[PDB]
Scaffold this active site. Structure first.
Site, short mmCIF file in Angstrom:
data_model
loop_
_atom_site.label_atom_id
_atom_site.label_comp_id
_atom_site.label_asym_id
_atom_site.label_seq_id
_atom_site.Cartn_x
_atom_site.Cartn_y
_atom_site.Cartn_z
N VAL A 22 3.98 -4.38 -4.72
CA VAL A 22 3.64 -5.78 -4.54
C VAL A 22 3.97 -6.19 -3.11
CG1 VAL A 22 3.96 -6.38 -7.00
CG2 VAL A 22 5.86 -6.61 -5.38
N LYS A 133 -12.30 -0.68 3.70
CA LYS A 133 -13.10 -1.47 2.77
C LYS A 133 -12.69 -2.93 2.94
CE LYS A 133 -9.82 -0.84 -1.02
NZ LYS A 133 -9.71 -0.54 -2.48
N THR A 172 -12.59 4.36 -2.33
CA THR A 172 -13.39 3.56 -3.25
C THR A 172 -14.81 4.12 -3.28
OG1 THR A 172 -12.05 1.63 -2.76
CG2 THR A 172 -14.18 1.23 -3.80
#
Ligand SMILES: Nc1ncnc2c1ncn2[C@@H]1O[C@H](COP(=O)(O)OP(=O)(O)O)[C@@H](O)[C@H]1O
Ligand SMILES: [Mg+2]
Lengths: 303, 63
Positions: A22, A133, A172
């Site tokens: 996080v 990305k 990805t």
């Protein structure tokens, strides 16, 4: 017994999620200065994930550039690792393009030049990002004209000069290069393929490769089967299309490099080569692009 | 973020207060599209039409 982050930093709200980490805003309490703390719970990590965590820490320390997130501090405690970054407050570049409403080739060229400068710096340091990305393109602040900041080195690898090797399946799908999909040995050119995908999206607001069948998606990427359909591409300069073609080149040895792309006239001569026409349909599509990503991210979390 | 999820459905709904099954089919893979169609109730609020789905009711049930 090492608790320097717990001692000297105060944590506040979450700023971003991650698969196994996080990011929370923090303040170095003595100085009162704000940072971003990327926190990994290390208590039950595998040895491989320890290695990857340590790798990301080394690479982040190594990279100092105006368009790369800047590591301020790094602190190891019993069951948590903290990477402390200079705080960037401009959010995602793609969300800012939509929020500011107006976007031209000249804007896209200025954006991608910055991205290319970040990437060139990574490669000069023997680092391949492998995860270029939209979610990893941030803006330094909410100031109009704030700098692009390349983020998230979680997938980044170290290479030695120009040698290629099979560094694994990572990234990805929509941004993956043909050589990775073919399981060929690869290296720095995988970043420039991903830059071509991003730049395509900056110009028309939708991805060059798209198919719900991921097997067909990978066939299309490996065939370099993208198009510049009418009407949207009729108004895109030949030079912008030419730069995309050179980034979306299947043969990685012939694909344009970051240094060459920075000399491409659409980039190096943006003022006289890149169109200044606002592309309303590009922003409209980008708005749907961002919504599709957030929903597809919120949905599988619920499933 | 519950304010960004309904807002994202609304964007895919072209700003309509409801979304259609064929819009989910067009904008999402066949998986989460037929997922949503069979968990989205029925929009009967203002401007409803045959087939209108209640993506806000599907959402706030979660976030
Ligand atoms: N330096 C930073 N300043 C502000 N926010 C950040 C910073 N770095 C990351 N974030 C927020 O946290 C999110 C996740 O960052 P990232 O490093 O990609 O984590 P992960 O790799 O675990 O997803 C980012 O999308 C961004 O919104
Ligand atoms: Mg990561």
């Amino acid at each position: 017994t090492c608790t320097r982050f717990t001692e000297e930093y105060q944590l506040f709200e979450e700023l971003g999620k991650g698969a196994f980490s996080v990011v929370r805003r923090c303040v170095k309490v003595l100085a009162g200065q704000e940072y971003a703390a990327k926190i990994i719970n290390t208590k039950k990590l595998s040895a491989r994930d320890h290695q990857k965590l340590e790798r990301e820490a080394r690479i982040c320390r190594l990279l100092k550039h105006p368009n790369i997130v800047r590591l301020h501090d790094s602190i190891s405690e019993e069951g948590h690792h903290y990477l402390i970054f200079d705080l960037v407050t401009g959010g995602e570049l793609f969300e800012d393009i939509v929020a500011r409403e107006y976007y031209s080739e000249a804007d896209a060229s200025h954006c991608i030049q910055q991205i290319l400068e970040a990437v060139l710096h990574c490669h000069q340091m023997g680092v391949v990002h492998r995860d270029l990305k939209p979610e990893n393109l941030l803006l330094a602040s909410k100031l109009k004209g704030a700098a692009v900041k390349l983020a998230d080195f979680g997938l980044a690898i170290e290479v030695e000069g120009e040698q290629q090797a099979w560094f694994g399946f990572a990234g990805t799908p929509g941004y993956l290069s043909p050589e990775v999909l073919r399981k060929d040995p690869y290296g720095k050119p995988v970043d420039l393929w991903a830059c071509g995908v991003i730049l395509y999206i900056l110009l028309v607001g939708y991805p060059p490769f798209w198919d719900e069948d991921q097997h067909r998606l990978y066939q299309q990427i490996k065939a370099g089967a993208y198009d510049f359909p009418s009407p949207e591409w009729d108004t895109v300069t030949p030079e912008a299309k030419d730069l995309i073609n050179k980034m979306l080149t299947i043969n990685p040895s012939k694909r344009i490099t970051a240094a060459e792309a920075l000399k491409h006239p659409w980039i190096s001569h943006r003022s006289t080569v890149a169109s200044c026409m606002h592309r309303q349909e590009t922003v409209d599509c980008l708005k749907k692009f961002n919504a599709r990503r957030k929903l597809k991210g919120a949905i599988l979390a619920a499933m | 973020t519950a304010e960004q999820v309904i807002a994202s459905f609304r964007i895919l709904a072209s700003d309509k207060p409801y979304i259609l099954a064929e819009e989910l089919r067009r904008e999402l893979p066949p998986d989460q599209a037929q997922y949503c169609i069979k968990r989205m109730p029925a929009y009967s609020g203002p401007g409803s039409v045959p087939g209108a789905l209640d993506y806000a009711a599907f959402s706030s049930a979660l976030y």
